[PDB]
Amino acid sequence: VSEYELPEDPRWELPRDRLVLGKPLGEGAFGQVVLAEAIGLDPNRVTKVAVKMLKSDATEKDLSDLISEMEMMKMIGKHKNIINLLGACTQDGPLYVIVEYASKGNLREYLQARRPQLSSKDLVSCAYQVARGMEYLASKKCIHRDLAARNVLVTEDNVMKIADFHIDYYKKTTNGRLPVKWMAPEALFDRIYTHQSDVWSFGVLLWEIFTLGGSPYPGVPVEELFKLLKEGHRMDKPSNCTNELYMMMRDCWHAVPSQRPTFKQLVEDLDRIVALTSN
Amino acid sequence: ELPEDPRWELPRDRLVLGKPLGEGAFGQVVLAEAIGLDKPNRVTKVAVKMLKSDATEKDLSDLISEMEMMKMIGKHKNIINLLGACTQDGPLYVIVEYASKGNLREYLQARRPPPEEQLSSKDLVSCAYQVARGMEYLASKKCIHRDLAARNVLVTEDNVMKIADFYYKKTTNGRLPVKWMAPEALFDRIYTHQSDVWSFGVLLWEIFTLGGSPYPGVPVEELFKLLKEGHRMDKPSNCTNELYMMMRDCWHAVPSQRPTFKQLVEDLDRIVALTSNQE
Ligand SMILES: Cc1cc(CNc2ncc(Br)c(Nc3cc(CCc4ccccc4)n[nH]3)n2)on1
Numbered sequence: 051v052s053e054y055e056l057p058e059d060p061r062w063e064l065p066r067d068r069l070v071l072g073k074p075l076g077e078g079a080f081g082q083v084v085l086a087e088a089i090g091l092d093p094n095r096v097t098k099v100a101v102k103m104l105k106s107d108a109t110e111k112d113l114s115d116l117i118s119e120m121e122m123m124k125m126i127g128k129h130k131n132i133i134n135l136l137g138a139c140t141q142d143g144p145l146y147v148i149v150e151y152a153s154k155g156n157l158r159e160y161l162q163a164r165r166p167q168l169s170s171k172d173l174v175s176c177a178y179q180v181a182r183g184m185e186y187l188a189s190k191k192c193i194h195r196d197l198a199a200r201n202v203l204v205t206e207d208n209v210m211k212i213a214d215f216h217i218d219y220y221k222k223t224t225n226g227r228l229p230v231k232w233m234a235p236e237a238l239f240d241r242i243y244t245h246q247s248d249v250w251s252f253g254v255l256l257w258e259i260f261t262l263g264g265s266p267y268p269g270v271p272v273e274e275l276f277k278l279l280k281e282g283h284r285m286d287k288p289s290n291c292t293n294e295l296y297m298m299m300r301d302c303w304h305a306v307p308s309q310r311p312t313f314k315q316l317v318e319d320l321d322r323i324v325a326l327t328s329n
Numbered sequence: 330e331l332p333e334d335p336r337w338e339l340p341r342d343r344l345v346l347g348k349p350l351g352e353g354a355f356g357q358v359v360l361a362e363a364i365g366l367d368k369p370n371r372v373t374k375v376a377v378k379m380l381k382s383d384a385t386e387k388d389l390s391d392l393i394s395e396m397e398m399m400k401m402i403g404k405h406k407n408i409i410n411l412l413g414a415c416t417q418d419g420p421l422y423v424i425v426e427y428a429s430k431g432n433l434r435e436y437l438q439a440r441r442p443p444p445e446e447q448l449s450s451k452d453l454v455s456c457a458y459q460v461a462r463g464m465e466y467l468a469s470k471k472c473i474h475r476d477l478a479a480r481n482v483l484v485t486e487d488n489v490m491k492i493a494d495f496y497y498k499k500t501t502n503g504r505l506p507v508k509w510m511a512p513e514a515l516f517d518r519i520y521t522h523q524s525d526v527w528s529f530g531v532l533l534w535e536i537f538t539l540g541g542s543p544y545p546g547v548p549v550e551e552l553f554k555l556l557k558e559g560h561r562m563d564k565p566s567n568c569t570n571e572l573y574m575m576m577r578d579c580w581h582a583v584p585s586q587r588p589t590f591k592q593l594v595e596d597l598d599r600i601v602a603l604t605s606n607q608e
């Protein structure tokens with residue numbers, strides 16, 4: 051257990067004949083993600099879905115991580131602004147974790163492909179949506195520890211969906227960026243992770259939206275980032291970004307976590323800003 | 330002994346040495362009172378450069394050459410002008426204009442919102458216009474600066490910008506001079522008016538960040554990388570797109586594509602007249 055078999059869950063189980071596996075989408079946390087077609091998830095209608103499964107070189111550890119991510123997604127519940135669980139194939143074969151398909155890829159890549167196609171209102175709506183998804187995850191006692199535009203997926207209908215539910219400082223991503231650049235000083239220095247440290251990361255994510263997928267602190271090594279933060283240095287105001295939205299970024303980047311806004315306050319402020327912003 | 334030049338010689342009794350102002354290129358600078366520089370009964374506050382007690386024969390020859398060069402250059406409102414010299418029977422005193430408000434970097438930092446009175450957007454563009462005018466004058470006298478930075482610009486009691494002094498070593502403020510250098514000056518040791526234009530672009534960024542430190546958190550080796558791959562500094566938080574485009578133009582990879590100081594003067598003159606002093 052679960053060497054020969056996984057326990058069932060009829061709430062989420064989908065017969066394997068109702069799932070037609072398609073093209074690979076890319077790697078994700080704990081395995082590989084493929085595009086698929088599923089027949090009646092929630093009856094005779096076909097839905098394009100994403101399927102996460104282990105890589106052929108996975109171990110028992112990788113399997114237990116994939117099961118725990120599936121179990122956590124069952125516990126989190128539905129929200130428009132998160133990648134939702136739709137089903138699972140757990141019996142008689144490889145584990146398939148079936149979730150929502152976001153056709154336009156990650157938010158970083160989505161914003162870069164739209165650099166001079168996105169109005170000021172579109173950019174604020176993108177921020178409102180991420181804040182809404184974060185507020186929901188926070189209420190479900192979920193701490194992201196990795197909120198960045200790369201961890202946000204965009205659907206065909208431009209809906210923002212968050213894709214996350216001794217740690218290395220020098221490790222780089224596929225686009226060659228350091229995750230420490232999204233971390234609050236207290237998470238970075240004291241390994242203290244809270245909803246307030248995720249608020250700091252949201253401020254970095256706001257900067258990524260307003261620079262249309264810009265790279266934080268470019269050319270700044272890990273050790274130099276530590277000194278800049280300790281010195282109270284903050285990233286510059288992205289070009290064309292309003293002072294109000296920069297003040298929001300700066301508020302998210304307050305040194306005292308209790309002084310940063312909550313996700314509930316960010317949602318209310320962003321809701322108001324979206325309605326006032328021109329398209 | 331030094332040869333006498335009656336055009337510039339002032340008797341030693343006509344100069345009353347006062348408080349030290351600070352260190353400068355090739356020696357030490359003190360505040361002084363010169364009796365009858367022009368009416369013979371009038372005193373004028375002047376700056377006096379002299380060698381430090383630990384100066385060498387190279388230091389003396391460098392001080393003489395700076396004095397000799399200043400004699401040739403001729404007068405301009407936007408450069409520190411030579412007023413006289415005590416060259417006979419005692420230490421060499423190079424007497425020049427006194428700029429009471431110190432260097433431009435320190436002048437802009439003391440005027441940041443919290444200390445001295447805030448500068449309007451028009452004041453900042455006027456400051457850039459004045460430095461460009463001084464540079465245009467020096468360029469017409471076939472003079473290449475090689476070290477244009479806000480630290481090398483002095484400010485008078487009347488807010489007149491005056492240019493002075495026309496890889497791991499740090500200044501008194503812990504800044505790397507390589508951060509003001511064009512790639513061709515940095516890599517090939519090629520210094521032209523076009524490499525001074527690059528430095529002017531860096532100086533513009535210092536004005537618009539109110540004495541900000543260029544490429545914060547970027548080490549020398551990483552700066553080399555970034556420049557080679559075409560990376561440039563971000564637009565300062567408080568800077569129009571037009572003024573950022575000017576900086577970027579100054580930072581053109583191909584030196585022949587950079588604006589000249591003549592073009593920068595005309596553009597800045599037009600921008601000053603269009604810029605508001607209301608904020
Ligand atoms: C973040 C991220 C990117 C990837 C895979 N790379 C990828 N490239 C292009 C496209 Br288009 C695309 N779409 C897509 C992926 C998903 C859910 C994945 C999932 C998320 C959470 C839990 C299980 C599965 N839905 N739609 N995915 O996995 N996590």
Ligand SMILES: Cc1cc(CNc2ncc(Br)c(Nc3cc(CCc4ccccc4)n[nH]3)n2)on1
Nearest residue numbers: 350351352353358376378426427428429431493
């Ligand atoms: C650049 C720089 C800063 C310094 C000395 N440090 C200083 N601190 C405060 C104040 Br206020 C002040 N004023 C001032 C300095 C000068 C001419 C210097 C000079 C330049 C060239 C030749 C001779 C003399 N005039 N007025 N200077 O020297 N070069």
